[PDB]
């Protein structure tokens, strides 16, 4: 078993914040092999951070990823309500991949 | 681009075989790789199985509480990419997820949509 655990679990945001969850491993892997997920309540992990600081087709550019380590976080810049996901992290470096407790956004 | 498209879901009586399919299109990735991650509200998400191409044939790699139980299996002639559970128990209920990624140096996975598959007695 490797570990990615995600501060914190549930957030509040009043649209117009700037929010950031982080997420760690247990053993240092390398940046570019964590990649962020969003879901949205009713669908699939919808693919949107790739790389440490990738953003995939789409995702808004008010968005922020970056981190070498052991920690790696989000941000968003000014929260809107289509953000309100639950977000995950994701580990590709070494089997077996494991991912985040994920946490979840809601908007205040 | 893509279009994933997975089917065969539904649920067996525990103990049930099955074989959850998705077919690739756009692609003909000279070389990609692909794995079935699944989803249930106990477990949150978790990488299942994966077969891989990075152009020799079949090599695949599974997990603590997968092995023995499912086999990844696809070939590109076609299209196809077949994943059979056996044995299955409660504990692997959920909705899985068929996504394929290529080996380009940069760019980003893709995914489906899923379906659901219940190991009921019922």
């Known amino acids: 078993d490797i570990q990615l655990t995600q501060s914190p679990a549930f957030m509040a945001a009043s649209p117009g914040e700037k929010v950031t969850i982080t997420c760690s491993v247990s053993?240092?892997?390398?940046?570019?092999?964590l990649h962020w997920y969003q879901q949205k309540s009713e669908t699939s992990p919808k693919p949107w951070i790739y790389?440490?600081?990738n953003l995939a087709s789409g995702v808004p550019v008010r968005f922020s990823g970056s981190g070498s380590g052991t920690s790696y976080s989000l941000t968003i810049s000014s929260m809107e309500a289509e953000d309100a996901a639950t977000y995950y992290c994701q580990q590709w470096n070494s089997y077996p991949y494991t991912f985040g407790g994920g946490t979840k956004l809601e908007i205040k | 681009e893509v279009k994933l498209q997975e089917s065969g879901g539904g649920l067996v009586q525990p103990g049930g075989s099955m074989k959850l399919s998705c077919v690739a299109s756009?692609?003909?990735?000279?070389?990609?790789?692909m794995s079935w991650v699944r989803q249930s509200p106990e477990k949150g998400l978790e990488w299942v199985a994966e077969i891989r191409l990075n152009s020799d044939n079949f090599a695949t790699h599974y997990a603590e509480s997968v092995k023995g139980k499912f086999i990844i299996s696809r070939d590109d002639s076609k299209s196809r990419l077949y994943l059979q559970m056996n044995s299955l128990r409660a504990e692997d209920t959920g909705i899985y997820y068929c996504?394929?990624?290529?080996?380009?140096?940069?760019?980003?996975?893709?995914w489906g949509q899923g379906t659901s598959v219940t190991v009921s007695s019922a």
């Open positions: 996504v394929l990624r290529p080996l380009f140096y940069y760019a980003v996975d893709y």
């Open positions: 053993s240092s892997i390398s940046s570019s092999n």
């Open positions: 756009g692609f003909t990735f000279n070389n990609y790789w």
């Open positions: 790389g440490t600081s």
